[PDB]
Amino acid sequence: ATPDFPTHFPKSSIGIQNELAGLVVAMPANSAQKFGYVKSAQGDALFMLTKDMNQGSYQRPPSLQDGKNYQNWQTHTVELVSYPCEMDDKAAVETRKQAMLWLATHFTTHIDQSNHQPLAPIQSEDGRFVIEITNAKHVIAAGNGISAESQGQTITMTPSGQQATVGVAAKGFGTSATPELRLLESAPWYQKSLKSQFASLTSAENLDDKELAANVFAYLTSIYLKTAELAKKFGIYINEWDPMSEQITPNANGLTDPKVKNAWEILPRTKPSKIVEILSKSDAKAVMKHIKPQLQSRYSESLSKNVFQYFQDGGEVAGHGINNATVGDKHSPELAILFEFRTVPNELQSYLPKT
Numbered sequence: 094a095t096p097d098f099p100t101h102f103p104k105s106s107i108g109i110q111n112e113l114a115g116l117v118v119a120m121p122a123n124s125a126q127k128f129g130y131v132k133s134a135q136g137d138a139l140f141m142l143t144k145d146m147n148q149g150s151y152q153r154p155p156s157l158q159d160g161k162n163y164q165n166w167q168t169h170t171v172e173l174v175s176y177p178c179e180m181d182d183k184a185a186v187e188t189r190k191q192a193m194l195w196l197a198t199h200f201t202t203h204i205d206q207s208n209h210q211p212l213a214p215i216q217s218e219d220g221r222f223v224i225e226i227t228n229a230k231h232v233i234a235a236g237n238g239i240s241a242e243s244q245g246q247t248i249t250m251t252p253s254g255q256q257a258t259v260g261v262a263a264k265g266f267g268t269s270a271t272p273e274l275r276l277l278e279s280a281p282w283y284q285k286s287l288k289s290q291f292a293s294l295t296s297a298e299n300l301d302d303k304e305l306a307a308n309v310f311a312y313l314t315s316i317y318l319k320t321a322e323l324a325k326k327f328g329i330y331i332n333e334w335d336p337m338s339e340q341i342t343p344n345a346n347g348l349t350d351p352k353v354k355n356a357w358e359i360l361p362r363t364k365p366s367k368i369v370e371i372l373s374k375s376d377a378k379a380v381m382k383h384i385k386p387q388l389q390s391r392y393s394e395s396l397s398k399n400v401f402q403y404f405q406d407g408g409e410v411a412g413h414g415i416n417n418a419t420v421g422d423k424h425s426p427e428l429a430i431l432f433e434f435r436t437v438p439n440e441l442q443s444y445l446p447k448t
């Protein structure tokens with residue numbers, strides 16, 4: 094079984110996603126996404142071997158007929174998904190990049206001499222890296238997996254196939270305390286002016302933590318307003334809001350449509366309603382009560398009510414969120430909130446392997 098991601102980090106954390114070019118994985122229909130993982134010789138899990146983009150049904154080349162059942166098998170692109178590490182852990186970052194580059198060279202040899210065969214659990218020649226196979230029901234094939242023989246491809250990785258996910262303490266969002274926090278706060282959807290705006294609205298209120306409440310208000314309001322903006326732009330059916338009732342033609346399949354996720358640029362990956370836990374019950378109620386008018390002064394009553402209600406009931410920004418991530422002291426863990434960089438910015442390029 095492929096280990097689940099570790100959830101706790103002392104400070105800011107980072108994960109990388111790297112789509113490979115030059116090959117496909119073929120697996121039975123409705124297989125689990127993970128088919129293996131690469132770990133260090135010391136035992137530390139570095140990255141997962143996953144299927145990503147469906148490339149159509151798999152057909153075993155007739156010249157490679159082996160008496161085996163490949164019925165209803167699907168081909169997919171391969172994505173290498175790192176286990177998260179500490180952002181400032183140079184050794185952990187470098188080992189992940191080197192292990193991905195080694196695996197690409199091992200795949201290059203695999204499609205040359207073992208085309209349309211599963212990957213075997215092996216140790217690298219230098220002894221640094223180990224492949225563990227968790228689903229033996231797969232095959233690796235050059236190109237698009239149609240021909241029996243490769244075109245002598247080198248397995249590569251490119252910025253267009255790359256993403257990074259940064260995890261930070263939820264209490265830090267809006268403080269600009271670290272370079273990672275300043276990078277996240279530069280997201281176009283994040284409206285820092287909402288912090289001082291909240292301060293002006295709540296002068297007569299006796300808040301348990303005014304600075305923390307203003308940070309949470311600005312974070313949540315920015316997300317709610319961006320969601321309403323995107324629903325209107327792409328004609329998204331959010332909760333009970335119908336874009337067609339406001340003469341908007343749908344041009345996305347939902348909040349999880351890749352073009353909608355790209356529009357965020359820095360995509361929140363954690364359920365927004367979780368951040369309410371970092372505040373006192375009293376402070377949370379004061380923050381929540383002030384969000385509704387921010388939507389209603391910019392958007393229709395129906396869109397404002399539907400976006401507010403959706404996130405209040407634990408709705409996700411774009412599908413299944415990473416909601417169990419934590420930061421700080423292992424004994425008294427604090428909420429971590431994660432963000433996907435849809436395109437890797439210059440500041441995070443050093444975390445990504447380069448062919």
Ligand SMILES: Nc1ncnc2c1ncn2[C@@H]1O[C@H](COP(=O)(O)OP(=O)(O)O)[C@@H](O)[C@H]1O
Pocket residue numbers: 098099100101106107108109110126174175176177178257258259260415418419429431
């Ligand atoms: N605590 C964490 N801190 C930072 N990044 C994390 C953390 N947990 C997971 N990630 C990262 O999030 C990404 C996971 O997205 P993914 O599971 O591949 O989506 P899906 O399976 O739905 O296609 C990886 O880069 C992983 O390292």
Ligand SMILES: [Mn+2]
Pocket residue numbers: 126143144145172174
């Ligand atoms: Mn995936």
